[PDB]
Design a protein around this ligand. Structure first.
Ligand SMILES: NC(=O)CSCC(=O)Nc1ccc(F)cc1
Lengths: 300, 237
């Protein structure tokens, strides 16, 4: 198990760790989070009590270094930092544990939720989407735009998601205009899977990574990316049987985890009705269709 | 965006534009089979592509053979339309290519947009106007070339005859849509009007009769009467 210590908590803040969250009061004696499962990426995220504007946070993998959080009173936020001195870090962590000033990552032993939401997310691949090569962890916030949103303005602070556009020359082979636009299998399988993602693991990973940014930060461009990646599969007649089965599981856990009260803004009526009822794959997403119909029948 | 009563004069500025109408591309008769079922038989069709400023009509004739062995023909017809309009633009010299293409039915937007990805600077627009170009097949000479075609064929017409020698393209388009609206509401009466007086003929190289300015005022008024009427006979007023 690993630990993310905090130098202190000078400002009142709601702290998230993966799908968990807890409130810390101004100058309360909080020194971090312990018992974090090794073997998974993680995200630690923040919403200030004084300004619910700007949810922000850090994707990280404990296997890649010793990370801690320290408030910066100039920039006004909790920053992730790396400690290179390993002895200094065990010493600090052990002292904070002995004084029991850390919250425990509160995993129920039956629960595979986080694994199911992050199966194909990779920290090295994530570093390419949120470009900042000097850090091993990646910052995201509610306001960051995507490269395609910038095409439609700071590229250093952008989410470099794979750009999907159904009315583009990349999507449409000269002479197959009608075929390719109504059955997107060419774009999915040849253009995207074979020749950019390289395999469906990278494809599911970005789709998983998009969703989590949409849910945890309300990042609108991420939501756009998540729905686009769903729609491309759903609008393809020819999809590997194994990809459909996994997609159903992926989406099922995303729908299960979404806050019931955020459905109105994180779910696109048109994509979901298309995918579940009109598309080629309308009869291939049994688990997802069942939870959608029992949880958000209003959207449909 | 869309075209409507507020930006109507944009049609007659000096930016090349074309209207495209696909309502006569896929045409059928419905009939009973010997077993008492219903079947369709397609007949020849046409794409109606018109420069509203100049009157140049690019009439692409759609021969029934293009449907053979095909499924979902009403959907294919929209993509066949977009394919032929794209081919036409590509065949024109650059300085003759349109800057805007206005489709008369919104269902044509995505088919045409996709067929024209190579021309990102050509704007594809819908329209809120209810234009009567479906009545083009009530113009005898256009109906005649479509029905006689034995192969795919493009035929060029000026739908304004020589009117631009005497009137503006705003007025020429107004006359055209009034004629076509009348032909659409009651084809019989409309044609009776246009041809009653046997001393006014249609020149071999024209579509409409050789009316004087004064005779056109009479004709135009008679067509408005017809349209109000039918609108009464229809709505009882
Ligand atoms: N050519 C490239 O390197 C882009 S290939 C996309 C890719 O690997 N996307 C991804 C994003 C976040 C993840 F957590 C996992 C995968």
């Amino acid at each position: 198990m690993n630990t993310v210590p905090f130098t202190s908590a000078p400002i009142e803040v709601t702290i998230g760790i993966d799908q968990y969250s807890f409130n810390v009061k101004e100058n309360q004696p909080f020194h971090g989070i312990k018992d974090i499962p090794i073997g998974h990426v993680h995200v630690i995220h923040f919403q200030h009590a004084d300004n619910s504007s700007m949810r922000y946070g850090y994707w990280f993998d404990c296997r890649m270094g010793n990370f801690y959080i320290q408030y910066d009173p100039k920039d006004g936020l909790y920053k992730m930092m790396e400690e290179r001195d390993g002895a200094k870090f065990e010493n600090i962590v052990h002292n904070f544990k002995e004084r029991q000033m850390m919250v425990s990552y509160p995993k129920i032993d039956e629960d595979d939720t986080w694994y199911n939401l992050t199966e194909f997310v990779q920290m090295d691949k994530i570093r390419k989407i949120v470009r900042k090569d000097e850090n091993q962890f990646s910052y995201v916030d509610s306001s960051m735009t995507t490269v395609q949103e910038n095409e439609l303005s700071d590229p250093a602070h952008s989410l470099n998601y794979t750009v999907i556009n159904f009315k583009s020359r990349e999507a449409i082979r000269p002479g197959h205009e009608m075929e390719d636009f109504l059955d997107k299998s060419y774009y999915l399988n040849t253009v995207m899977l074979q020749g950019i993602f390289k395999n469906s693991s990278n494809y599911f990973g970005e789709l998983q990574f998009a969703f989590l940014n949409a849910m945890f930060f309300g990042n609108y461009g991420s939501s756009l990316q998540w729905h686009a990646m769903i729609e491309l599969i759903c609008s393809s007649a020819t999809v590997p049987k194994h990809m459909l089965d996994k997609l159903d599981e992926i989406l099922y856990y995303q729908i299960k985890t979404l806050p019931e009260q955020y459905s109105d803004i994180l779910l696109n009526e048109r994509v979901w009705n298309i995918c579940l009822y009109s598309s080629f794959q309308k009869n291939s997403l049994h688990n997802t269709e069942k939870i959608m119909e029992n949880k958000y029948p209003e959207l449909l | 965006g869309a075209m409507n009563s507020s930006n109507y004069a944009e049609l007659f500025n000096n930016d090349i534009k074309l209207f495209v109408d696909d309502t006569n591309v896929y045409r059928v008769t419905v009939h009973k089979t010997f077993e008492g079922n219903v079947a369709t038989k397609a007949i020849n069709g046409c794409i109606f592509t018109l420069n509203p400023k100049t009157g140049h009509l690019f009439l692409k004739i759609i021969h029934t053979s293009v449907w053979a062995g095909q499924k979902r023909l009403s959907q294919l017809a929209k993509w066949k339309t977009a394919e032929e309009v794209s081919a036409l633009v590509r065949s024109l010299p650059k300085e003759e290519q349109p800057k805007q293409i206005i489709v008369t039915r919104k269902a044509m937007l995505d088919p045409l947009e996709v067929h024209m990805l190579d021309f990102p600077n050509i704007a594809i627009r819908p329209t809120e106007l209810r234009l009567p170009f479906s009545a083009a097949m009530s113009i005898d000479k256009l109906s005649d070339v479509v029905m006689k075609a034995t192969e795919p064929q493009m035929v060029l017409f000026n739908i304004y005859d020589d009117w631009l020698d005497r009137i503006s393209s705003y007025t020429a388009f107004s006359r055209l849509t009034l004629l076509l609206r009348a032909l659409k509401t009651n084809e019989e009466s409309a044609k009776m009007i246009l041809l009653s007086d046997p001393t006014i003929t249609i020149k071999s190289y024209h579509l409409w009769p050789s009316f004087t300015d004064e005779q056109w005022i009479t004709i135009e008024s008679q067509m408005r009467d017809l349209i109000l009427t039918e609108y009464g006979r229809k709505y009882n007023v």
